[PDB]
Amino acid sequence: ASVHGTTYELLRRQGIDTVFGNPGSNALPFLKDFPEDFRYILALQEACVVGIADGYAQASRKPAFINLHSAAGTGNAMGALSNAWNSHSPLIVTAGQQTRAMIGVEALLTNVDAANLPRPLVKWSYEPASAAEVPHAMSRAIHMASMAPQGPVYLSVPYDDWDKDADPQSHHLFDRHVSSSVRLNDQDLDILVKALNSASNPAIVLGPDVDAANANADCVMLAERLKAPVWVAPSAPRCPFPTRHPCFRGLMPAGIAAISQLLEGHDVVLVIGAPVFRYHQYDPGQYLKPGTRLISVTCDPLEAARAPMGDAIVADIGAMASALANLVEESSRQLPTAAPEPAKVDQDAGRLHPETVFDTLNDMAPENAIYLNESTSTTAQMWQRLNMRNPGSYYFCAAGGLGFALPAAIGVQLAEPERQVIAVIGDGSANYSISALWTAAQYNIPTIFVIMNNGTYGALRWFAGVLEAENVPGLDVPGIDFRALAKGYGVQALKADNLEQLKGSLQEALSAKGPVLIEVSTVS
Amino acid sequence: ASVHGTTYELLRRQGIDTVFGNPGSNALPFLKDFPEDFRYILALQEACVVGIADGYAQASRKPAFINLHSAAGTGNAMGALSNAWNSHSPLIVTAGQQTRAMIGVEALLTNVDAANLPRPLVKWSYEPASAAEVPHAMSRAIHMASMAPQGPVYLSVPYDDWDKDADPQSHHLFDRHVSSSVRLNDQDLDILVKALNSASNPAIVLGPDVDAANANADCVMLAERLKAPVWVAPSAPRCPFPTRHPCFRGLMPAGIAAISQLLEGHDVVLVIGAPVFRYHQYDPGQYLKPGTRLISVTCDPLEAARAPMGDAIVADIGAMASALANLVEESSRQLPTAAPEPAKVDQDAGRLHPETVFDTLNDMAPENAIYLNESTSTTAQMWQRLNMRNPGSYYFCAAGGLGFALPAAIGVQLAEPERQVIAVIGDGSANYSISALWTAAQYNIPTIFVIMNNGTYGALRWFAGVLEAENVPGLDVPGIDFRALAKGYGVQALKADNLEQLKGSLQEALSAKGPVLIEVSTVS
């Protein structure tokens, strides 16, 4: 067998059937003879390739396979890899390298020092020392991406390796099963359970690894047993809990003092599947107030090590959430009361307040919609206004890197064909990965793109105003016609200049058979 | 003085007056109070920021200054940095980092292990250990980028450093002059000159560092004295010689055997300002035929070390070319005969042959036009059909990384306002950095963009055919409306479906006052 045939067999046997890519010559011997049972998804720029793959992996809860071209292709994707690192996305990034005989002279298209290029944004990065090693290296990549804490990996393969003979002993790779589905030993788990049962006013904080693990329902049971309020950890990449459940208390503000104030009076705070904490703004103060103890369950040693406070347990989130939910006592305390309905913001017949948009989306979208957010000045309002009952309903760039939501929304929609995906993207953010729209058109992936057009990098203008910072250049983005960009890439385009037009356009978009972009004129 | 004021003073004193950027919050304390004598050039994605800066630096023959946001912004630019490495572009890449007090907890927007992120594509990469070090680190960056061999550098600066007090002793940085304008010692230079004078059939090969050094005219004198044919080294990023000079012999094919055959019978081959050699295709054979000696002059130790053949001298190209041109004897041999006019390809009233496009551009463009090439299946024909008399007339992605020409053409046009820039870009390549078009519109930088629309990744289809490779996915890019994309970003848009429409559109574009995109229907 050739290295090509053995490698595709390994991929198939390990559950991979899709290649997200942008082709080049170094990968031609990999891509030729492409197997009929595999699908290739082309995108026009590598940030888009990796963003699509990332959304696919996060929504599918399985690894996604990528093929890029050499250093330039890899490099074009490194912003996307920053997000994938922070979201623990299981991405297998392969990159085509020059033929081994041309690497020393540094021929055009040579990826110099290839394994160092994606660092520090990958869990493992490698170039094999021989062709016959390629299947084994691919096995390593698959498992490294997939073991907790999941994350992106990188494998560079010389052009000429694919046609070489494989080692027959590579067959032992095909059906390897590698598990990291582990939980705290019984003795120490019983201590934790007793601490939770004994708490007088517990609180729960959930992060994105809960949604990745599909541990959401277990966390609902846990919260109901403990009669505890539930927050989402700051800078949330995913939504880990039903947002109209009575226990839900919303997105934590991403500041040190704000969080310790929120947690004051709670004697035990159990954090599951989040870093402690993904703060953002400068908000100095106490990490915790006196009388609060924090206990973190995390799938990631790097998270446990860097927490500035609390105990930690490094384990699989799915396994731990299920165990905890089924072991804790039912508290006799009263169940928390649901948060009230958010206020309706006054809206005239002009430009749309973002709150209006979110309220209308919540009114018209299916109950099993999936939302993506890259509307950076409106996140707090979005989190208050969308009733997200189901797992897998929200994605936000986990490293804050813009250019995620537009391509990721296409990958999510590919992963969840029955669930309508609605990406809410600012006019600034929409540009970073604009060319991803073409993939939605070409493959007829029916994502809806809602462009929040305020003409500015609003979150930056806001921050400069808080700072009283004057004479800051580059904060405005006038003169972009998003309907024309959509037309450029073959996607149906609508405008919404007022509330009536927003409802009419959303009605049209929801019944369409293909992707749709709606440009919304929002208040500036 | 603050670190901000000292740093901007250093930049001004060192000749920097322009910041190419995409803003974020980590850089707000750098960008606020932006000096009135500086200009900020915004682009909508960081590949575009760096590509624009790169074209500006290459055409201006001086460093260009960039400011990006953290890891995601840096990462979005890494493909662009691959090209800048290969072109020896002097780019000073700064990236905003989180406040020092938030780096340990890895707050959102922290650039983890920042100095490692752009490696191996930078000459120097650094994060200062204290605020007061920032001016000194900036000095280091400026000089590292600017010393031969020029190249990109990276500096990560925490948000909170800018407002801190600077060290008064930083004033010693302001007027430092650092020179690498060096040439071979007299004794060894006399040996080289004697070897050139004694050659019976010398040949010259020129690469991009000749054009960077503006050594073109000196090389013309050298060629005329030695009565030697002149080739451009393969995979050419720049044009180092007038292409209708009698000695000019064109672009070398990027293959080992092809080049040694071309050089057969030439007893001494002098290579200036090129790697030896930037081969591309697999074309095995002899590096040199018997009877050929090669001597390379390079500004880059890494080039000299990796050449598989020949002697080398590591020195400044400008200094060496000027010395050699003025020291060699006038040979009594006959001056080479100019290459004939290229053939006119038969053209019907339908889709355009690329040869037709290039011939029409050469007919209608000013004699001091500047061309950029990212039409990857048509490069050989382009090089034969454009009369480029002047230095600085050609750019091509030096690492083969697509997404260079569209933004670089804007930066070149900013650098050379009197010289009409014409970027010839394939329909595939145009997508990688499409959003750069907006910068041309916003700043009214009057670049002309010629999109070669054949509906395919033609160079890849070509290569797959040579290989007889079947079932290769992802090679076609149907369904892109480039006039609509231009409209999207505010750039005047024309179509050319046939030769009459090509001439009419070029006539319109050449008289326009702003940027123009022309979508040309080319033969598939």
Next chain:
Amino acid sequence: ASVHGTTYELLRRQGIDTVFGNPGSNALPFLKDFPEDFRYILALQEACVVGIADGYAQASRKPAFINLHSAAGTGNAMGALSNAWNSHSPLIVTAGQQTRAMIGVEALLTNVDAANLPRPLVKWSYEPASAAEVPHAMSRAIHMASMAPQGPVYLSVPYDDWDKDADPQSHHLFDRHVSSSVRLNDQDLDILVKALNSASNPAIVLGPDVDAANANADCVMLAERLKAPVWVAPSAPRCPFPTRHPCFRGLMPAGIAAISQLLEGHDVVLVIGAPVFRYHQYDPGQYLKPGTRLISVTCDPLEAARAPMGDAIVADIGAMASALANLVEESSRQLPTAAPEPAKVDQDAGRLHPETVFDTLNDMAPENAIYLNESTSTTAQMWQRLNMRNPGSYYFCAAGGLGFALPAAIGVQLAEPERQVIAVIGDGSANYSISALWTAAQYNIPTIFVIMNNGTYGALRWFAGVLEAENVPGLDVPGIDFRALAKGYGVQALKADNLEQLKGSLQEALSAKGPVLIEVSTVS
């Protein structure tokens, strides 16, 4: 030809005939069939291997070739590489790697991520992608080590590569000549010369790259023409000037304020072949006083970039010193007056003051002796008391890394068999690389080792006293019998408890036919 035969041919053709090594199995296919015209120098630990090679390279002014075993051998040498980086030592470090078929499984003796292991202490680090690339990679290593600024490089080679067929086209590597012997262009050199001629009170500062280049005599001529005092730059790794020449002013103190005070009143300070500056102690103040301009000539871009003051020129030190010495005018100013004789310190019939030792060495040693210094509390006195007339007469650990002098003294003595080497090493420092003594015994390399036994890490005790730092552990090293250690490794051993015994032992050592260690009881 095999890769082994081609590689040894390349080495021989490039002037390498000695391998400094500690063997292991991964290198057995390299070391077998060892050519009869090569010499292998074994040392018992890899810090010793590299230190010996380093002294050999520095004294020979040519590259030295090393072979180590995998990661553990490489790692044992990394302290030695820190010194070699700072001294610009041209070292070619090869390390044996596992067979390619065993690298993926990470068999015992695999060097994981090998090229990253020695970073950041090497100029270039590489593992070839195929066996046939090994000769080309070796060529790259040779030239990278040897081009200015010289320095160490690293090449990792899989076991199985050596026996494979080489590429016949590797013959083009054998006789490549690569030059970096360059100087400032004539126009800018004339400006520099005019600035030197016009100075009213010039000063010269020389660093180790002057001695490496054998530019010492040229610098003497330069100093005499300009009638300028000459200092050695701080933390001096080498001696660049005759220390009893009338212009010589000694070792600069390694502090910011001390140096600017020393240079006050000097209108032009010309620094050659040194960083600006290798400060050590905290001594804050002005980099330069008003009225002093500094101009640096350096072979190293990294030095030129980081200087906090002055202009710089990046060029070959040999070429620049020769040009400057022969172009400057003869000043009519008076020649500086020689420094007086140092004072004789009162010495009783007990333990030796270090000043006594140095005075006695200067009295009894040949005029062409070579000294090494790793007696860290006595350096200033050593520099005042030794008349070093000739180039190549002094070495000191260039990164301050102890464990250099003992092995380096053996390599220097191998390089300079007619020049008596005398290493003056503290009792603390002697331990780091003690096993190097065996190589001197086995190869009968007749180095004299003078152990300054004060029972303490004296320079650290001194510093703790300046700090008024109390309760510092680990500063005393009682209970080491150096005569017994010498016996252990086969080296003749003497003691000197008083001045009479010091003279008698030195008389014995100087007439011996093999290496000798003298343990001197020095004042504490």
